[PDB]
């Protein structure tokens, strides 16, 4: 509506009720709406980080976001007791438990990775569930497995804190470009999990890519990483009766279908529609047989253990346990014909689950909570980055360097406030470390926090007075070395121009850092940084003459989708006023098959370092078909 007089600030004062995703953004009143909406987009585009940290400057709603976003953690919902543990793989296993109140029998599943979509996934901290053994009670709110986002006390982190300085690094930090320390890039690490299906029919066999002559292994094992980005390759045969192609195991050909991924496979699920005796005779199936047997061994194992509970009259089983039991029973049961896409399939279909630690690489996009964007232009050694010299903070190196030009134009001032607060906090930490008793340290801490956030100061006084002297010393050391928590609420409770002004006036010793080779003094302060989903790999295309969807089906390493030339492109090329060469490129590259063959042949038969191509003048195949059909139509072109 036009009327905004209805909005009265006194009504919404002290409440963040009007904020949603921006509850994760400090000093949101100071950031523009455009930057805020970009931040909201980035949070969904954010990728999981192995070494995620709770933000140094926090809004205090982050833990709630971790709590109510259930995809990252598994919490027991009742008191349980561990009946038994069954293993399918070293990495994948199931735990059967009984409700201590209902008596219902339920199960919990353990796996290394969680697959979300495409390549996106994350590894699990499975410490607690792995600790559990038979006849061990699971308390009501225990967390069996957690994501890397959550910590020991279930604090939530979507990014890492990196020391940042606004500096013009050899023009590498141009526009939204960033230079990162190699150690810092190690901190910003993601996982990639892929579920890849290879379908081998009766006439297809898998080449011995991972095996010797004595032992035939055509695909990686559960504990082995993929080599050369090839899981397996299938050769289709016209008739598998001869079995003469035993000698062909090592070689590869273009006709063979190759399946591409990199990482450690962690689970194999095989769906077989072939009788066991038919499979056993051939040695080339040996590896497959093992996993098939293993699956059956797992399934049978659950069936024997749970048959009394499920098929007993009481049937105090959860629906999950019932369906798991039924599926395993179907697997062991004969006359089980597996159908994929509503059709019965020959041979077997294998699903590999592959987990890879994907590191930060050039072209990756990283951001802060304030809508800024950055692309990693260069990763440089720690020594090459700005390092302050001849101070109490001597040898401190900046993890990331950001563009100073245009910072105010972005209309997201809050990133600077985060930097200033962590930088001033460094001085407070050194002041605590340098001198005093524990009481002096808490006094300095409480004064600084009183300057920043009164609520944090009050709660910290309570928390500190609660602590024992040993615990107090440990907490103080944690603050000195790891960092200091500072609370900057989104709208109500953040500091401003006047408060930072007072902070700078009181702390006269705090002044810019003098770096080693830099004339201009610099400020180095920690900023919270997040890793975005975009990487160059998504849009890479490269094509050489002989969508296909093979790449989506993992049959091609990279997309070979052709680029399109149109009338606009032809006009811009026609600027040269040499139309014949443009037509030659079009015919040699696309339209004319004869000229295309000539180009390929000449490129491979001519001198490597001197290439001159002569193309024959011939009507294209499309033109020939057009003339033939038109003459049948009864109309003929007169070169009008």
């Amino acid at each position: 509506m036009d009327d905004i007089s209805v909005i009265k600030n006194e009504d919404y004062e002290g409440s963040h009720r009007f904020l949603a995703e921006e509850l994760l953004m400090p000093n949101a009143n100071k950031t523009d709406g455009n930057r805020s909406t970009m931040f909201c987009s980035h949070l969904a585009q954010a990728v999981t980080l192995q070494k995620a940290e709770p933000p140094l400057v926090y809004t205090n709603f982050e833990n709630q976001v971790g709590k109510y976003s259930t995809a990252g953690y598994r919490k027991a919902n009742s008191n349980y007791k561990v009946i038994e543990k069954i293993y399918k793989n070293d990495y994948n296993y199931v735990l059967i438990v009984q409700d201590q109140e209902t008596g219902e029998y339920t199960l919990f599943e353990r796996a290394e990775c969680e697959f979300l979509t495409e390549h996106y996934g994350f590894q699990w901290d499975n410490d607690k569930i792995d600790s559990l053994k038979k006849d061990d009670t699971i308390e009501k709110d225990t967390v069996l497995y957690k994501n890397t986002c959550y910590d020991e006390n279930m604090n939530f982190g979507y990014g890492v804190n990196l020391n940042a300085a606004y500096f013009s690094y050899k023009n590498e930090t141009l526009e939204d470009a960033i230079v990162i320390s190699e150690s810092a890039a190690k901190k910003l690490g993601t996982f990639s999990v892929n579920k890849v299906k290879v379908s081998v029919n009766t006439n297809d066999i898998l080449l011995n890519l991972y095996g010797d002559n004595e032992n035939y292994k055509g695909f990686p094992d559960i504990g082995e990483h993929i080599k050369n980005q090839i899981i397996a390759s299938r050769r289709r045969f016209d008739y598998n009766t001869a079995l003469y192609e035993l000698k062909n195991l090592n070689e590869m050909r273009d006709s063979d279908t190759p399946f591409f991924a990199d990482g450690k496979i962690v689970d194999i699920e095989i769906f077989s529609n072939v009788p066991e005796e038919e499979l056993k005779v051939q040695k080339y199936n040996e590896q497959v047989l093992y996993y098939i047997n293993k699956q059956k061994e797992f399934s049978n194992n659950v069936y024997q253990k749970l048959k009394k509970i499920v098929e007993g009259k009481d049937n105090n089983v959860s629906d999950k346990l019932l369906h798991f039991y039924n599926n395993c029973k179907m697997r062991i049961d004969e006359n089980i014909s597996y159908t994929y896409q509503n059709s019965k399939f020959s041979g077997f279909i294998m699903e590999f689950t592959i987990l890879e630690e994907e590191p930060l690489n050039k072209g990756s996009k990283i951001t802060g909570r304030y809508g800024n964007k950055g692309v990693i232009s260069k990763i440089l050694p720690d020594d090459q980055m700005p390092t302050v010299a001849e101070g109490r903070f001597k040898g401190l190196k900046a993890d990331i360097c950001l563009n100073p030009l245009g910072v105010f134009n972005r209309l997201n001032p809050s990133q600077l406030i985060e930097q200033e607060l962590n930088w001033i906090a460094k001085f407070i930490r050194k002041d605590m470390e340098e001198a005093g008793s524990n009481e002096e340290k808490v006094s300095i801490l409480l004064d600084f926090l009183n300057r920043v956030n009164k609520e944090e100061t009050e709660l910290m006084e309570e928390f500190i007075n609660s602590l024992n002297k040993t615990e107090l010393e440990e907490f103080l050391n944690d603050i000195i070395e790891n960092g200091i928590p500072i609370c900057q609420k989104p709208f109500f409770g953040n500091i401003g121009l006047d408060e930072l002004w007072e902070l700078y006036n009181h702390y006269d010793h705090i002044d810019y850092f003098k770096c080693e080779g830099i004339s201009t003094p610099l400020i180095i302060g920690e900023i919270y940084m997040v890793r975005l989903k975009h990487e160059p790999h998504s849009k890479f295309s490269a094509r050489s003459t002989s969508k296909s969807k093979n790449f989506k089906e993992h049959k091609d390493l990279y997309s070979k989708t052709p680029v399109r030339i149109g009338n606009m492109e032809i006009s811009n090329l026609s600027l040269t006023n040499e139309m014949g060469s443009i037509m030659d490129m079009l015919n040699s590259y696309s339209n004319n098959e004869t000229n295309r063959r000539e180009l390929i042949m000449q490129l491979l038969t001519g001198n490597p370092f001197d290439t001159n191509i002569d193309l024959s003048d011939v009507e294209s195949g499309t033109s020939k078909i057009l003339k033939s059909l038109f003459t049948c139509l009864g109309l003929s072109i007169d070169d009008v």
Binding site: K362, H534, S544, V563, N572, P608, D610, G634, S636
Partner: protein, 410 residues
């Protein structure tokens, strides 16, 4: 459908050698040499031995009888709405029949027409009177119309498009008519309906070829005008490059390998004395991961090739001068993960693109002659603004660059 274009006199171009007067689809368990699928006149799978192209066109003979030209049928239908009724055999003359229609056509055209409505069509009929009736109807090559073999319960059966059915039906009808000498003595009056069905089938053949143009002949050709799919093409994200000339760029390991694959295979075959297939195996191994040996072959190509290794970089929409640029591959990246093209900041303003994740198309140019002609699109030539003749600020110093010179001088 309706187009104004030159007509062809079929009789002059008709060739008796490629005449399909045999209607049998198969003869004695073999493809008929006189059949529609004839290896002798149309060609076969071994097309290189045949030396006969898709352009090979068969013929069918209706002599001694004439049919209405299928392309010209619609204009006659507008002139004579009763054409469909009149041709069938079952004013002064009504529904006489096709053969009778030919004799009285000139009078009939004047008899049943509105001059104001169809004068242009009537004038066209006067102009192309000789082409109204056709003695021979063409049939296009069997290679275009495939007949796939399938196994059948009674016996193996050949699946083929309806166009083949239309052709074989037409030949089947005509073949019996010419044979009969003493049957025809008085049968000639009911022989006329047989010719009528032939005319309708030929019309559907004409309509099907019109649909054939829609089914990836004219649709594919006009789609090519919409977008010609060029091989030796690439798409890549752009990242800033420092320390190298403006025209020179840095290309990822994967990007160079595919585009210059055949050039790369040539060197490996020459250096290691191996077969082209074996050299491909070396290239396939290199694609998987960074190996110094394939990098060495790639480095030698960029270093030693005449004119350098050059390409065209376009940012779409290609609406401005400098949208497509002729550039040189200065360096090949040694990081397999790095998949970003390295470009000078000065080029960006001409392209009008941004380092925001936008992708630019890479089309390499190989021929030294083509390299020279496209060198007119190089950044160096575009230093001069074409409207003014002055230096172009698009290639001038940018934000970070200006500040350093300013601190130096001011």
């Amino acid at each position: 459908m309706g187009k104004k274009l030159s007509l062809i006199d079929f009789n002059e171009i008709y060739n008796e050698e490629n005449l399909i007067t045999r209607a049998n689809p198969i003869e004695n368990h073999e493809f008929s040499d006189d059949g529609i699928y004839s290896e002798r006149i149309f060609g076969s799978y071994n097309e290189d031995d045949d030396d006969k192209d898709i352009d090979t066109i068969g013929w069918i003979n209706i002599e001694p009888y004439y049919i209405i030209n299928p392309i010209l049928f619609t204009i006659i239908k507008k002139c004579i709405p009763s054409i469909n009724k009149i041709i069938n055999y079952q004013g002064e003359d009504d529904y006489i029949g096709l053969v009778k229609f030919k004799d009285n056509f000139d009078d009939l055209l004047e008899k049943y027409t509105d001059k104001k409505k169809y004068q242009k069509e009537y004038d066209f009929l006067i102009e192309n009177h000789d082409k109204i009736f056709i003695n021979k109807l063409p049939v296009f090559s069997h290679k275009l119309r495939p007949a796939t073999l399938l196994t059948g319960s009674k016996g193996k059966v050949l699946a083929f498009d309806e166009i083949n059915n239309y052709y074989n039906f037409v030949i089947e009808y005509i073949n019996q008519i010419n044979e009969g000498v003493v049957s025809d003595d008085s049968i000639d009056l009911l022989l006329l309906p047989l010719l009528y069905n032939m005319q309708f089938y030929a019309n559907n053949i004409l309509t099907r070829i019109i649909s054939e143009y829609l089914r990836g002949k004219k649709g594919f050709l006009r789609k090519n005008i919409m977008g010609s799919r060029i091989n030796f093409s690439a798409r890549n994200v752009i990242t800033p490059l420092i320390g190298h000339p403006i025209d020179e760029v840095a290309m990822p390991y994967k990007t160079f390998a595919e585009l210059y694959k055949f050039q790369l295979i040539n060197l490996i075959s020459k250096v290691k004395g191996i077969n082209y297939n074996e050299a491909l195996k070396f290239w396939e191994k290199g694609i998987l991961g960074f190996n110094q040996e394939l990098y060495n072959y790639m480095e030698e190509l960029i270093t030693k090739t005449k004119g350098g290794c050059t390409f065209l970089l376009n940012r779409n929409p290609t609406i401005s001068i400098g949208s497509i640029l002729y550039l040189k591959i200065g360096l090949i990246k040694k990081d397999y993960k790095d998949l970003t093209l390295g470009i000078s900041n000065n080029l960006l303003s001409a392209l009008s693109g941004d380092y925001d994740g936008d992708v630019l198309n890479i089309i390499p140019v190989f021929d030294n002659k083509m390299k020279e002609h496209f060198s007119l699109l190089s950044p160096q030539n575009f230093l001069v603004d074409r409207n003014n003749g002055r230096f172009n600020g698009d290639f001038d110093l940018q934000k970070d660059q200006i500040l350093g010179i300013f601190i130096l001088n001011n």
